[PDB]
Amino acid sequence: NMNVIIADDHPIVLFGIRKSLEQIEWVNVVGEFEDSTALINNLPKLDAHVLITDLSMPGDKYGDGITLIKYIKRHFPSLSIIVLTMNNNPAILSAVLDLDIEGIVLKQGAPTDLPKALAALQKGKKFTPESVSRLLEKKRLSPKESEVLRLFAEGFLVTEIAKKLNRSIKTISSQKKSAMMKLGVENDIALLNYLSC
Amino acid sequence: MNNMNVIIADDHPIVLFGIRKSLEQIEWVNVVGEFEDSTALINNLPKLDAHVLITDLSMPGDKYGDGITLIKYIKRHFPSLSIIVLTMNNNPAILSAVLDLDIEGIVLKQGAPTDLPKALAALQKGKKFTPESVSRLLEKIYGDKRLSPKESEVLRLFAEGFLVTEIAKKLNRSIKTISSQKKSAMMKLGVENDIALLNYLSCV
Numbered sequence: 001n002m003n004v005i006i007a008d009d010h011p012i013v014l015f016g017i018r019k020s021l022e023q024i025e026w027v028n029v030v031g032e033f034e035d036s037t038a039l040i041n042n043l044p045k046l047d048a049h050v051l052i053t054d055l056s057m058p059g060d061k062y063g064d065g066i067t068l069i070k071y072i073k074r075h076f077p078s079l080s081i082i083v084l085t086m087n088n089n090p091a092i093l094s095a096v097l098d099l100d101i102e103g104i105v106l107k108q109g110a111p112t113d114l115p116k117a118l119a120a121l122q123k124g125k126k127f128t129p130e131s132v133s134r135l136l137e138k139k140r141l142s143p144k145e146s147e148v149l150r151l152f153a154e155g156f157l158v159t160e161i162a163k164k165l166n167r168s169i170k171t172i173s174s175q176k177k178s179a180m181m182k183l184g185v186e187n188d189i190a191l192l193n194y195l196s197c
Numbered sequence: 198m199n200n201m202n203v204i205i206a207d208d209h210p211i212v213l214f215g216i217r218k219s220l221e222q223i224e225w226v227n228v229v230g231e232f233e234d235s236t237a238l239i240n241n242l243p244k245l246d247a248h249v250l251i252t253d254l255s256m257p258g259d260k261y262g263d264g265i266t267l268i269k270y271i272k273r274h275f276p277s278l279s280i281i282v283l284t285m286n287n288n289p290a291i292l293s294a295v296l297d298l299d300i301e302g303i304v305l306k307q308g309a310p311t312d313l314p315k316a317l318a319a320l321q322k323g324k325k326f327t328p329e330s331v332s333r334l335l336e337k338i339y340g341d342k343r344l345s346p347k348e349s350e351v352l353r354l355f356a357e358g359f360l361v362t363e364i365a366k367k368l369n370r371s372i373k374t375i376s377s378q379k380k381s382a383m384m385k386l387g388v389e390n391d392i393a394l395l396n397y398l399s400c401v
Contacts, residue, residue, distance in 0.1 A: 154264025184393025192290035
């Protein structure tokens with residue numbers, strides 16, 4: 001059998017996932033945790049092959065999100081991870097791709113796709129749905145562009161940035177514009193909201 | 198009397214002078230300090246017995262931060278201090294972000310002579326301050342041409358990883374109509390591609 005651990009802050013989500021896996025005869029659920037502290041403390045005590053885990057979840061000691069996933073992959077390299085997320089969030093998904101985890105499943109199609117992700121992990125392959133893989137397939141910022149947006153995100157006008165960094169307004173405008181293009185944002189409002197992440 | 202000790206912060210000396218002169222008229226206001234950089238401002242704050250700081254959003258001085266981060270730091274370390282941010286920047290997202298810091302006022306520098314006295318008066322009244330100039334910009338908001346309820350639902354479904362073909366079936370509309378509603382929606386939010394679109398949606 002494949003021993004599986006499930007992790008999510010909502011207990012009925014926890015229940016739903018288990019009922020989504022009870023059909024699979026060769027699967028055995030060995031743990032269900034609602035916070036990251038319980039999960040980390042108990043990982044050393046369970047012989048699990050795969051973790052199905054949410055990205056958002058309580059526990060400040062080891063936190064949540066991308067850092068928690070990194071922590072787990074580093075310390076449990078024998079454990080294959082299926083990240084379970086509500087949204088298609090390229091920044092997260094890419095960061096997750098970099099850490100070489102074995103699966104991404106969107107919560108909307110979990111009942112259908114969770115069995116498919118486990119079968120795929122079983123036969124060596126990774127699992128991403130079309131919506132995700134299309135994005136993952138699809139020019140980073142220069143350091144000068146990065147400093148222009150930082151100051152812009154702090155409330156500095158282009159004129160104020162020119163003085164501070166000691167370049168012409170044309171150059172600042174150019175560098176900002178160039179950076180906006182790399183991020184795919186058309187206007188300053190969209191830029192600033194964007195930079196909140 | 199029960200006067201309001203005020204500190205002014207701005208990099209430009211004549212602006213500083215202008216702001217002080219805009220306050221000389223208010224008799225219960227007493228200017229206890231003027232600073233051209235954020236470092237000497239922070240170093241001297243404890244010694245002055247100020248009730249309110251009127252500061253420019255963008256000043257020199259890197260040690261304690263720039264802009265919004267400087268305002269954050271000041272608010273942490275001087276919680277009794279009432280802060281009116283004075284800015285030349287008329288971008289709604291800046292103005293909104295500034296007020297999210299729970300400071301006591303924001304004022305457009307271009308209207309300082311008129312709006313600054315009004316801010317201090319509202320501060321005195323036990324009222325916060327966004328003058329007409331500012332509130333007009335914050336109501337404009339992600340945009341004045343806001344998303345229709347149909348556009349909203351198309352995006353919510355797309356964010357959840359539905360393909361446009363799936364979204365068509367679910368909302369019971371043609372692929373064309375869904376593509377058009379998505380594109381329309383992207384224009385309104387100011388995002389060019391799906392990667393930018395989906396990153397934007399996690400933030401918001």
